[PDB]
Amino acid sequence: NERKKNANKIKKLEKTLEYSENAKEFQLYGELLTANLYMLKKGDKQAEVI
């Protein structure tokens, strides 16, 4: 049990894990806005980026 049990629960961990990262996307762009922190409005959605 404990062998197969936790083998199952831990491949299950991995299975559930692979999906979401959602961090460096928008991290690098927060850095971009910090860089271009002089062309901004508080009232926009879009950006222009390099």
């Binding site: 850095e31 971009l32 910090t34 860089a35 271009n36």
Partner: protein, 132 residues
């Protein structure tokens, strides 16, 4: 504005593109001005102070690298002592103190060699290093 950049690198936007993008300079233009003047090692670190007049007449003084950098290269540390006065993760010489004096006595900030060393060693204990 103080910048802290390797002598051979250019166009790191995120550091100065803000810092003198409100000033509005060519990122690679000024960074290659910097490399042309300090045409030296990339991966190095020069402190460099830029002075801009009201009409955007920029000049700057490059200066000697940090003793942190020189002694990271000496001892082989990436971070300083995780706890100075409890961990010493790096070691140098009195000879190294004199080497760094002769390196940077232009930039050093006490008129005597011994008071220069007092400040240098204030920094050596700041970053937690022992002597050989």
């Amino acid at each position: 504005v103080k910048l802290q950049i390797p002598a051979g690198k250019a166009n790191p936007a995120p550091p100065v593109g803000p810092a003198l993008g409100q000033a509005g300079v060519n990122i690679m233009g000024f960074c290659k001005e910097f490399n042309a003047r300090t045409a030296d090692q990339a991966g190095l670190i020069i402190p460099v102070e830029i002075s801009v007049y009201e009409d955007r007449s920029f000049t700057f003084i490059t200066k000697t690298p940090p003793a942190a950098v020189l002694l990271k290269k000496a001892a082989g540390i990436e971070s300083g002592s995780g706890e100075p006065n409890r961990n010493k993760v790096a070691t140098v010489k009195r000879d190294k103190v004199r080497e760094i004096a002769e390196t940077k006595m232009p930039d050093l900030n006490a008129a005597d060699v011994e008071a220069a060393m007092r400040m240098v060693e204030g920094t050596a204990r700041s970053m937690g290093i022992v002597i050989e």
